[PDB]
Amino acid sequence: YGPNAKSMPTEEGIPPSANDLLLHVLEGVPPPGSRRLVVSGGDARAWLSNEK
Amino acid sequence: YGPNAKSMPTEEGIPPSANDLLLHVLEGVPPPGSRRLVVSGGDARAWLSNEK
Amino acid sequence: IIKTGDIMFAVLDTSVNSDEPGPILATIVTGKLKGSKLIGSFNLPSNADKMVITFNTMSIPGAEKTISISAYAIDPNTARTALASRTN
Amino acid sequence: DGCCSKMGGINYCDSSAGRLVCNNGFYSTCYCTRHAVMDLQFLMGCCLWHGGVYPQLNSSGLVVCNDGYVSEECSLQK
Amino acid sequence: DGCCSKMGGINYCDSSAGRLVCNNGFYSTCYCTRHAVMDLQFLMGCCLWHGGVYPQLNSSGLVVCNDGYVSEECSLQK
Amino acid sequence: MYVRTNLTILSPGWLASMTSADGTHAYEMQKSPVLLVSWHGKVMQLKVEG
Amino acid sequence: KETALSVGAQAGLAWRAKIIDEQLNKQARNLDAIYDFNSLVLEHNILPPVLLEGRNTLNLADAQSIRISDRTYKVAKQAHFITTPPTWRQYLWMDYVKPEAPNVTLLPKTKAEKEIWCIYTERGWKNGIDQANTILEENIARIKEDFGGMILYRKLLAMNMVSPPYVSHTDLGVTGDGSEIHIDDRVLRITALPELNVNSAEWRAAVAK
Amino acid sequence: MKFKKPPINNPSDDATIKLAEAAVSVSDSMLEMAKVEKVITPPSKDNTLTIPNAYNLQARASVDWSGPIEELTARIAKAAHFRFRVLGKSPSVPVLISISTKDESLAEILRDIDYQAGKKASIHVYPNSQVVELRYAKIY
Amino acid sequence: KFKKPPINNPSDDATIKLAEAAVSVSDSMLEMAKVEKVITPPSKDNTLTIPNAYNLQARASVDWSGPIEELTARIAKAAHFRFRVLGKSPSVPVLISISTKDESLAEILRDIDYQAGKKASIHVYPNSQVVELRYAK
């Protein structure tokens, strides 16, 4: 690559798999660095870690 | 290997045996420099020397 | 970071006469500051209709520093700057 | 107020269903835990069904949900 | 409150047993030395079953143990 | 016995070993006529002389 | 005004925590019975690892980008040595230090003040109770997680999906100097950390009756 | 003419409720584990052969033990009036057995103890010589 | 007259559920252990039986941790039996520890063989009052 470079088109990329924190969430352990949430109306649990 | 080379090896040794300080512990003399601890509810003696 | 001129509660434990200004200390009990302490002194007013206390020496626990935020006090449950004592 | 009125009386709250249990073996009808099946079909609050109420507060009365949509009815009128 | 009640009375304290001996030939049901066998399975203590309470001091109520885990119960709220 | 390779030994067990940056292993051990080598997730057995 | 809430929450948390802990301790033996760690310890006093399992996963990245899988397994914590099995206590027991100093600065003076103080204390104490309950929930989830992971490791090993751990013992005779001596020194060192095998050709299935 | 349902008991508690909620799933998983393990492996034999029962060994016992095995086996041998014998060197790591049964046989006590010890210990009985022998595992 | 039910009766639904779950898991683990445990019949156990020679019913105490041949020779000398060995002694000696106060030399020799295992074995001839220590190959 010369002085004017990094202009090649982006090649294909396999999308990443599902985020691995889902395993812990499903098991019931909240992810590290998260905080609990309050939800009513039924039987469910929630957490907020990465504005998600 | 040059300055830009990786050159990152590691070395391992034969594991050590247990501390001979435990021999003094077993014979009953407290280890030097430590302080006595308070034990309640049973038959035991305790000492703290080096956060151990 | 505290908003300009906001409200806090505190407790005074050491009594003093308005005769000799000197160090008087109080303790914050609620709000963000817990167990923080505050040294100050009073002033002598022109007339005996009120009495106010100067609070400047603020010491926050935990950290080794002494900030110099200056503040005054008001009468709780009365919302006045006077003093609850005898004037006759 | 008495959930188990005219019955044996309130025994305990089973959280497996969020239900009070009367002294007579029959289930009560009240709710004794937030984790209960409640069929509520109404809600309040503005900037609903969008990014939610934006945490920051603006000088103007205009309020925008976190998705970028602006809740006109929540914004004060003039 | 007599340990050797309706008995001869206290004779002395056997430390190897950690127990009082009544004047009649029996061991009292009272202890004398803390280095005895007491069957207790309940106790107290913050930061328990970890490195214990860390000796740090915090302006807020945040408290941690020497294992690095925190304890909301030992700390306060806000 | 000084044994140099790029794979890993499993059953005999070493008392001292060294590694290179490029990924070469060299173990020092006592005399053992039989060796167990693990690579690519599979373990096999081989034998030596003297 | 809010010291009411604070002290109510503290007292409620403490009381609920003490009650739940003592009830747990009272119902003791069955807990250790069900959470029998030791019988799952492998031969070489090696704590088996923990497996995480998931089924029918799908992730959407963006337009024309969706990745779907049927099953997934993960190694949560790598296996390692151990000198004594853990118990239910290091997961379920929760601490309790009783507060006894409600700072008597804001006190009830007039009747409405007393009433609002009482009700705020009550609601705060309820909040403390439910918060303690939630903490218990998290503890239960964590311990169930670990036990299930151990079980899943056992089952994958049975199904021949994870290589068993491997260790070597080297023995030396007399050792030391003229001042220090040891009769027989045994050095145990593990090499093969258990891991999944991608070669499906050796996978084994079983059928019951 | 009031109405009731049969099962009426003392009030429960949420902590116990959640304990049961976890435990039922744990039990189901363990059952499935044992089922698949048994169907995949071929069983071979029984330890009754290596420790057959005999006379003067039917006196009933009920135990609650959650510690090591030496005191337990010593007490059992003292009750059985048999010779006590030990083989092997006890490893530094203690071998711990927890048993909570009621009114079983001495032979079944020994069989259960040996089974729970598994690969770390073994039990032999010589009735003709009236001897009970416990052997540590030859490993390490 | 009066009858008191057992104190720790599961008189609650949660209690009964927990207790039965404990029963179930205990049973399952016991079955798994039973099916897993490896055993061998006494018909083909690799061990030495009791010679039952009258001189061997003596009672004594022995504490030791080291070479086996020395201790075995000492025991044979005590019992008035000839002592012999076959095989080449390995450079690394086989070392055993025994610390006992009162038992039979027969049991001592049985323990000796059990600890020796595959490394070597011991044979006893009472008709010709000799003991032999046979190495491995």
mmCIF file of N, CA, C and O in Angstrom, chain H residues 44-84:
data_model
loop_
_atom_site.group_PDB
_atom_site.id
_atom_site.type_symbol
_atom_site.label_atom_id
_atom_site.label_comp_id
_atom_site.label_asym_id
_atom_site.label_seq_id
_atom_site.Cartn_x
_atom_site.Cartn_y
_atom_site.Cartn_z
ATOM 1 N N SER H 44 -21.837 -54.813 35.339
ATOM 2 C CA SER H 44 -21.030 -56.028 35.346
ATOM 3 C C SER H 44 -21.350 -56.980 36.488
ATOM 4 O O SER H 44 -21.584 -58.164 36.237
ATOM 5 N N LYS H 45 -21.373 -56.503 37.728
ATOM 6 C CA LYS H 45 -21.441 -57.410 38.867
ATOM 7 C C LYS H 45 -21.914 -56.641 40.094
ATOM 8 O O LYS H 45 -22.324 -55.480 40.007
ATOM 9 N N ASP H 46 -21.854 -57.307 41.247
ATOM 10 C CA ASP H 46 -22.337 -56.770 42.509
ATOM 11 C C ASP H 46 -21.274 -56.953 43.583
ATOM 12 O O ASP H 46 -20.491 -57.904 43.547
ATOM 13 N N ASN H 47 -21.259 -56.029 44.543
ATOM 14 C CA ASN H 47 -20.313 -56.100 45.650
ATOM 15 C C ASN H 47 -20.760 -57.056 46.746
ATOM 16 O O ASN H 47 -20.009 -57.273 47.706
ATOM 17 N N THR H 48 -21.965 -57.614 46.640
ATOM 18 C CA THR H 48 -22.380 -58.649 47.579
ATOM 19 C C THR H 48 -21.410 -59.820 47.560
ATOM 20 O O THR H 48 -21.125 -60.422 48.602
ATOM 21 N N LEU H 49 -20.878 -60.147 46.382
ATOM 22 C CA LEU H 49 -19.917 -61.239 46.278
ATOM 23 C C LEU H 49 -18.675 -60.963 47.114
ATOM 24 O O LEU H 49 -18.204 -61.836 47.851
ATOM 25 N N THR H 50 -18.128 -59.751 47.016
ATOM 26 C CA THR H 50 -16.909 -59.447 47.754
ATOM 27 C C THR H 50 -17.161 -59.208 49.236
ATOM 28 O O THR H 50 -16.238 -59.383 50.039
ATOM 29 N N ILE H 51 -18.368 -58.809 49.623
ATOM 30 C CA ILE H 51 -18.678 -58.716 51.048
ATOM 31 C C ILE H 51 -20.014 -59.394 51.327
ATOM 32 O O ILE H 51 -21.020 -58.714 51.574
ATOM 33 N N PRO H 52 -20.068 -60.721 51.300
ATOM 34 C CA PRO H 52 -21.318 -61.413 51.620
ATOM 35 C C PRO H 52 -21.678 -61.254 53.085
ATOM 36 O O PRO H 52 -20.816 -61.081 53.948
ATOM 37 N N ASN H 53 -22.977 -61.313 53.359
ATOM 38 C CA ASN H 53 -23.443 -61.232 54.731
ATOM 39 C C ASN H 53 -23.200 -62.556 55.449
ATOM 40 O O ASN H 53 -22.832 -63.568 54.846
ATOM 41 N N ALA H 54 -23.412 -62.538 56.761
ATOM 42 C CA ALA H 54 -23.201 -63.712 57.592
ATOM 43 C C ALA H 54 -24.017 -63.557 58.864
ATOM 44 O O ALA H 54 -24.640 -62.519 59.106
ATOM 45 N N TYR H 55 -24.005 -64.602 59.685
ATOM 46 C CA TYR H 55 -24.705 -64.562 60.955
ATOM 47 C C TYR H 55 -24.066 -63.521 61.876
ATOM 48 O O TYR H 55 -23.024 -62.935 61.568
ATOM 49 N N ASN H 56 -24.726 -63.284 63.013
ATOM 50 C CA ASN H 56 -24.327 -62.281 64.006
ATOM 51 C C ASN H 56 -23.956 -60.958 63.345
ATOM 52 O O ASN H 56 -23.053 -60.248 63.791
ATOM 53 N N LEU H 57 -24.660 -60.624 62.265
ATOM 54 C CA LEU H 57 -24.451 -59.368 61.559
ATOM 55 C C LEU H 57 -25.776 -58.727 61.176
ATOM 56 O O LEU H 57 -25.815 -57.880 60.279
ATOM 57 N N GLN H 58 -26.863 -59.119 61.831
ATOM 58 C CA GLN H 58 -28.186 -58.621 61.498
ATOM 59 C C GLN H 58 -28.719 -57.628 62.517
ATOM 60 O O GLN H 58 -29.826 -57.114 62.335
ATOM 61 N N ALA H 59 -27.970 -57.352 63.581
ATOM 62 C CA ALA H 59 -28.390 -56.344 64.542
ATOM 63 C C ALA H 59 -28.589 -55.012 63.836
ATOM 64 O O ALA H 59 -27.795 -54.622 62.975
ATOM 65 N N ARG H 60 -29.660 -54.319 64.190
ATOM 66 C CA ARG H 60 -30.099 -53.183 63.400
ATOM 67 C C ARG H 60 -29.358 -51.920 63.807
ATOM 68 O O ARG H 60 -28.994 -51.734 64.971
ATOM 69 N N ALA H 61 -29.131 -51.052 62.826
ATOM 70 C CA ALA H 61 -28.413 -49.812 63.056
ATOM 71 C C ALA H 61 -29.119 -48.673 62.340
ATOM 72 O O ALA H 61 -29.711 -48.859 61.275
ATOM 73 N N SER H 62 -29.058 -47.493 62.950
ATOM 74 C CA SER H 62 -29.519 -46.269 62.312
ATOM 75 C C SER H 62 -28.480 -45.187 62.559
ATOM 76 O O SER H 62 -28.072 -44.962 63.702
ATOM 77 N N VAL H 63 -28.052 -44.521 61.489
ATOM 78 C CA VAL H 63 -26.876 -43.669 61.547
ATOM 79 C C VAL H 63 -27.203 -42.285 61.009
ATOM 80 O O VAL H 63 -28.156 -42.084 60.255
ATOM 81 N N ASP H 64 -26.387 -41.322 61.432
ATOM 82 C CA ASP H 64 -26.396 -39.979 60.858
ATOM 83 C C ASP H 64 -24.976 -39.442 60.991
ATOM 84 O O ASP H 64 -24.607 -38.908 62.040
ATOM 85 N N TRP H 65 -24.194 -39.582 59.927
ATOM 86 C CA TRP H 65 -22.774 -39.272 59.953
ATOM 87 C C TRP H 65 -22.410 -38.455 58.725
ATOM 88 O O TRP H 65 -22.847 -38.765 57.614
ATOM 89 N N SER H 66 -21.612 -37.410 58.929
ATOM 90 C CA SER H 66 -21.185 -36.548 57.833
ATOM 91 C C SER H 66 -19.721 -36.164 57.991
ATOM 92 O O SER H 66 -19.337 -35.012 57.765
ATOM 93 N N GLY H 67 -18.883 -37.119 58.376
ATOM 94 C CA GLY H 67 -17.477 -36.856 58.566
ATOM 95 C C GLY H 67 -16.596 -37.870 57.868
ATOM 96 O O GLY H 67 -16.958 -38.439 56.835
ATOM 97 N N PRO H 68 -15.411 -38.115 58.424
ATOM 98 C CA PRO H 68 -14.527 -39.140 57.858
ATOM 99 C C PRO H 68 -15.045 -40.537 58.145
ATOM 100 O O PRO H 68 -16.142 -40.697 58.690
ATOM 101 N N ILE H 69 -14.270 -41.556 57.789
ATOM 102 C CA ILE H 69 -14.750 -42.928 57.842
ATOM 103 C C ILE H 69 -14.123 -43.745 58.963
ATOM 104 O O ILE H 69 -14.653 -44.818 59.288
ATOM 105 N N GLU H 70 -13.021 -43.290 59.557
ATOM 106 C CA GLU H 70 -12.278 -44.140 60.482
ATOM 107 C C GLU H 70 -13.061 -44.385 61.766
ATOM 108 O O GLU H 70 -13.193 -45.530 62.210
ATOM 109 N N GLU H 71 -13.590 -43.323 62.376
ATOM 110 C CA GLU H 71 -14.403 -43.504 63.572
ATOM 111 C C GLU H 71 -15.616 -44.372 63.274
ATOM 112 O O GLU H 71 -15.981 -45.244 64.072
ATOM 113 N N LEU H 72 -16.246 -44.149 62.121
ATOM 114 C CA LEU H 72 -17.435 -44.906 61.759
ATOM 115 C C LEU H 72 -17.129 -46.393 61.668
ATOM 116 O O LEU H 72 -17.801 -47.222 62.297
ATOM 117 N N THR H 73 -16.102 -46.751 60.898
ATOM 118 C CA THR H 73 -15.786 -48.163 60.736
ATOM 119 C C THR H 73 -15.281 -48.772 62.035
ATOM 120 O O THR H 73 -15.534 -49.951 62.297
ATOM 121 N N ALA H 74 -14.585 -47.993 62.865
ATOM 122 C CA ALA H 74 -14.141 -48.512 64.152
ATOM 123 C C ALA H 74 -15.331 -48.862 65.033
ATOM 124 O O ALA H 74 -15.368 -49.930 65.653
ATOM 125 N N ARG H 75 -16.318 -47.968 65.096
ATOM 126 C CA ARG H 75 -17.505 -48.245 65.896
ATOM 127 C C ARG H 75 -18.260 -49.447 65.350
ATOM 128 O O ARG H 75 -18.753 -50.286 66.115
ATOM 129 N N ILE H 76 -18.356 -49.551 64.024
ATOM 130 C CA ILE H 76 -19.059 -50.680 63.427
ATOM 131 C C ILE H 76 -18.354 -51.987 63.762
ATOM 132 O O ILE H 76 -18.995 -52.982 64.114
ATOM 133 N N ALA H 77 -17.024 -52.005 63.663
ATOM 134 C CA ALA H 77 -16.280 -53.215 63.990
ATOM 135 C C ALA H 77 -16.419 -53.566 65.463
ATOM 136 O O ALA H 77 -16.530 -54.744 65.821
ATOM 137 N N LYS H 78 -16.409 -52.556 66.337
ATOM 138 C CA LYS H 78 -16.581 -52.818 67.760
ATOM 139 C C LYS H 78 -17.944 -53.432 68.034
ATOM 140 O O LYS H 78 -18.068 -54.351 68.852
ATOM 141 N N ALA H 79 -18.983 -52.937 67.361
ATOM 142 C CA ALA H 79 -20.299 -53.551 67.494
ATOM 143 C C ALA H 79 -20.315 -54.965 66.931
ATOM 144 O O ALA H 79 -20.981 -55.846 67.487
ATOM 145 N N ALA H 80 -19.596 -55.199 65.837
ATOM 146 C CA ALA H 80 -19.606 -56.492 65.168
ATOM 147 C C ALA H 80 -18.710 -57.522 65.834
ATOM 148 O O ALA H 80 -18.761 -58.696 65.450
ATOM 149 N N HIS H 81 -17.889 -57.114 66.801
ATOM 150 C CA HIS H 81 -16.988 -58.029 67.504
ATOM 151 C C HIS H 81 -16.023 -58.703 66.533
ATOM 152 O O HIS H 81 -15.723 -59.891 66.653
ATOM 153 N N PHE H 82 -15.537 -57.943 65.558
ATOM 154 C CA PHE H 82 -14.667 -58.479 64.525
ATOM 155 C C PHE H 82 -13.307 -57.799 64.558
ATOM 156 O O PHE H 82 -13.145 -56.698 65.091
ATOM 157 N N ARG H 83 -12.328 -58.480 63.972
ATOM 158 C CA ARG H 83 -10.987 -57.926 63.862
ATOM 159 C C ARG H 83 -10.990 -56.746 62.902
ATOM 160 O O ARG H 83 -11.618 -56.797 61.842
ATOM 161 N N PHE H 84 -10.303 -55.677 63.283
ATOM 162 C CA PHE H 84 -10.201 -54.482 62.457
ATOM 163 C C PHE H 84 -8.871 -54.498 61.718
ATOM 164 O O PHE H 84 -7.820 -54.697 62.336
#
